[PDB]
Write an enzyme that holds these catalytic residues in place. Structure first.
Site, short mmCIF file in Angstrom:
data_model
loop_
_atom_site.label_atom_id
_atom_site.label_comp_id
_atom_site.label_asym_id
_atom_site.label_seq_id
_atom_site.Cartn_x
_atom_site.Cartn_y
_atom_site.Cartn_z
N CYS A 196 1.18 -7.67 -24.97
CA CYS A 196 0.31 -7.09 -25.99
C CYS A 196 -0.81 -8.05 -26.37
O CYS A 196 -1.96 -7.63 -26.54
CB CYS A 196 1.12 -6.75 -27.24
N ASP A 197 -0.48 -9.34 -26.51
CA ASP A 197 -1.37 -10.31 -27.12
C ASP A 197 -1.83 -11.43 -26.20
O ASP A 197 -2.73 -12.19 -26.58
CB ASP A 197 -0.68 -10.94 -28.34
N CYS A 245 5.37 -10.11 -28.32
CA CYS A 245 5.00 -9.28 -27.18
C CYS A 245 3.90 -10.00 -26.41
O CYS A 245 2.75 -10.04 -26.84
CB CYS A 245 4.55 -7.89 -27.62
#
Ligand SMILES: Cc1cc2nc3c(=O)[nH]c(=O)nc-3n(C[C@H](O)[C@H](O)[C@H](O)COP(=O)(O)OP(=O)(O)OC[C@H]3O[C@@H](n4cnc5c(N)ncnc54)[C@H](O)[C@@H]3O)c2cc1C
Ligand SMILES: Cc1cc2nc3c(=O)[nH]c(=O)nc-3n(C[C@H](O)[C@H](O)[C@H](O)COP(=O)(O)OP(=O)(O)OC[C@H]3O[C@@H](n4cnc5c(N)ncnc54)[C@H](O)[C@@H]3O)c2cc1C
Ligand SMILES: NC(=O)c1ccc[n+]([C@@H]2O[C@H](COP(=O)([O-])OP(=O)(O)OC[C@H]3O[C@@H](n4cnc5c(N)ncnc54)[C@H](OP(=O)(O)O)[C@@H]3O)[C@@H](O)[C@H]2O)c1
Ligand SMILES: NC(=O)c1ccc[n+]([C@@H]2O[C@H](COP(=O)([O-])OP(=O)(O)OC[C@H]3O[C@@H](n4cnc5c(N)ncnc54)[C@H](OP(=O)(O)O)[C@@H]3O)[C@@H](O)[C@H]2O)c1
Ligand code: NA
Lengths: 315, 319
Positions: free
Chosen positions: B142-143, B139
């Site tokens: 997300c990161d 993701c």
């Protein structure tokens, strides 16, 4: 002066515009023909409440103007025309418009559906003089006056609800005793009935549209169970008995089923492919079951991706 | 809490909070079905893992995947959808009301719409499994923040890999896009944007390469060993994070032996005569990427979510 497009899209409803947006992002340089009702059927409704993600206040016309500007964001070539004849028997496909003629290597058909009429001579005689099929177009003429709506499906219910804000009384006339619409709209309908604003005339058919040299003055209705006639005084009549697919120009050119364009469907892709290779169909013109902006836009996307895969395979 | 209080009954239950599930909820709520929607662990679905979305028709300015999905949530709540935060880990479709068992509570329902979407696949290496959460991710939104100004890798050749590379190209110092072929399959407008970045040197292409091992220390990833697909020449690349973007697999493990599946996708009636989202179990319908291995767009998922609500309304009315 034949205008040639790699990909030609017929229709400026949600299916056509969604196809154009995807086709333009695939570098297909689509050409979209608007037709005579630019924006499509949604420009004849007022508020749209079930376009997912539009939870505040959105009108049909406002949504379709957004989609127009979206297709233009990616440089879709948008042409006004109305196609009056097509010849799909050989490639490139040939289309014949009121304004100009076209050829194309792939065709996406998204011509939607248009209102049907009951077929009476008196109905025809007063079309555009008090007989209408578009409540939002002609409703303002009847502020504080009695009007009629004929039909029992989701279009009749929506038009009666729209007119209930404008007319003194809405006479909703249907040849059965129940209505078919989203249940939230049935609830609204019966509330207006309990308020006296909508008057139901169930188990009635239209016998004659009455009027004078100006316009409509009333209706003669017939009791579907006894044959007994009755007259109703009103100033305008809105015919809302269903929208049939706009496929007259495809009779003799594509496989149709009750007027709908037959597509492959299925779970293996190429689902919008018609009986003619290189021709695809999306939106209401191929859907007799769901009939929503969101489902039309979804098949518009599929037709663009189907048409991209087809053109890629032509080398 | 006891075993009875842990069992919420719904007339219609919807599994998934992506565009298919939320569109189903909107239509089902307007059909007076009083829907209950179970969010799953990724509330908002896959579009919360992308940044800008440019092909949701009628959103022509600047819309993000998360912005659109927050709108859909508020739209479902406008018509009083009950939103339940849970994840279903087991079902029994052999009886009606259908029985579903969640991480937090259990459910029964008179009709079920499955809109569980798909989740990112991993290659399957031990070194990759070893560094998940320590430098291996699927993701990018997300990161990606944790790799600001550091080198990162993206593996894959499809639309997801290109979009993730383009997203990370604004955050990482360099994005290494790695793929086992010389060619990328994505929207051609995205491919154009990719090569603008490649030509700017912000993205570096590693074609004809497969991941041989994910390298790191005790604390996290430090690089990759790649293999030439043609010769077999192994080579190492220094980077701090790896985003695996090799496609998504439909979330259907909990339906095995309960529904007819095909390569993990839920088989539906399809066709042109309505009831198109009906699964092999009467009263169970499926919509979105969990049943679509061909188009995989938000707009197509929303369309089939609408269809599943209309099909479920026709089923419940007939009872
Ligand atoms: C009163 C009413 C209210 C509605 N309310 C809702 C609602 O709240 N929510 C919802 O989801 N749906 C609603 N709908 C349905 C929705 O409008 C349709 O499902 C949707 O518009 C279908 O899109 P389409 O692109 O397939 O076709 P259409 O919107 O019908 O568009 C067809 C297009 O093709 C063009 N065309 C036709 N013939 C030709 C030709 N010969 N040459 C060139 N172009 C041609 C037309 O000009 C038009 O631009 C409503 C419909 C009506 C009638
Ligand atoms: C990086 C990326 C970029 C994308 N960009 C675009 C784009 O620009 N345009 C576009 O049209 N599409 C795009 N897509 C695709 C789009 O996101 C998907 O097609 C769409 O989200 C599918 O919707 P869905 O509702 O079917 O599934 P999903 O969005 O996958 O939603 C599935 C839902 O089910 C839930 N769930 C799963 N298992 C369970 C369970 N056991 N119990 C309960 N709930 C469960 C999940 O939590 C989730 O809420 C992109 C996808 C990715 C990955
Ligand atoms: O919706 P749709 O486009 O899919 O089509 P549809 O359901 O066949 O028509 C919509 C509504 O109009 C009614 N209707 C259709 N044709 C009619 C006619 N000739 N005279 C009076 N009422 C008529 C239908 O009644 P019926 O349900 O009686 O056809 C239905 O209530
Ligand atoms: O959506 P979807 O699931 O259908 O995506 P998909 O199109 O199957 O995959 C997208 C990209 O990921 C690559 N890929 C898939 N599995 C892989 C693996 N195990 N190792 C390395 N690369 C892999 C594919 O390469 P290929 O183009 O070689 O399949 C493709 O270019
Ligand atoms: Na915005």
């Amino acid at each position: 002066d034949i205008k040639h497009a790699k990909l030609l899209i017929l229709g400026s409803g949600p299916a056509g515009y969604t196809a154009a947006i995807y086709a333009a992002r695939a570098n297909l340089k689509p050409v979209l023909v608007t037709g005579l009702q630019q924006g499509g059927q949604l420009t004849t409704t007022d508020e749209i409440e079930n376009w997912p993600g539009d939870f505040e206040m959105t009108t049909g016309s406002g949504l379709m103007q957004r989609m127009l500007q979206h297709a233009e964001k990616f440089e879709t070539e948008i042409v006004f025309d109305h196609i009056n004849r097509v010849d799909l028997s050989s490639r490139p496909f040939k289309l014949f418009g009121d304004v100009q003629n076209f050829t194309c290597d792939a065709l996406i058909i998204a011509t939607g559906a248009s209102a049907r009429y009951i077929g009476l001579p008196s109905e025809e005689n007063y079309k555009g003089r008090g007989v209408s099929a578009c409540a939002t177009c002609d409703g303002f003429f009847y502020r504080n006056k009695p009007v009629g709506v004929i039909g029992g499906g989701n279009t009749a219910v929506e038009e009666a609800l729209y007119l209930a804000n404008i007319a003194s009384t809405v006479h909703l006339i249907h040849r059965r005793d129940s209505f078919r619409a989203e249940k939230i709209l049935i609830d609204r309908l019966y509330k207006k009935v309990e308020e006296g604003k909508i008057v139901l005339h169930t188990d009635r058919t239209l016998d004659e549209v009455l009027g004078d040299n100006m316009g409509v003055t009333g209706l003669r209705l017939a009791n579907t169970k006894t044959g007994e006639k009755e007259e109703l005084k009103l100033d305008g009549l809105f015919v809302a008995i269903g929208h049939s697919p706009n496929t007259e120009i495809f009779q003799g050119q594509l496989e149709l089923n009750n007027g709908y364009i037959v597509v492959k469907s299925g779970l293996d892709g190429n689902a919008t492919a018609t009986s003619v290779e290189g021709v695809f169909a999306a939106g209401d013109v191929m859907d007799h079951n769901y009939r929503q902006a969101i489902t039309s836009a979804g098949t518009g996307c599929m037709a663009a991706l189907d048409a991209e895969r087809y053109l890629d395979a032509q080398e």
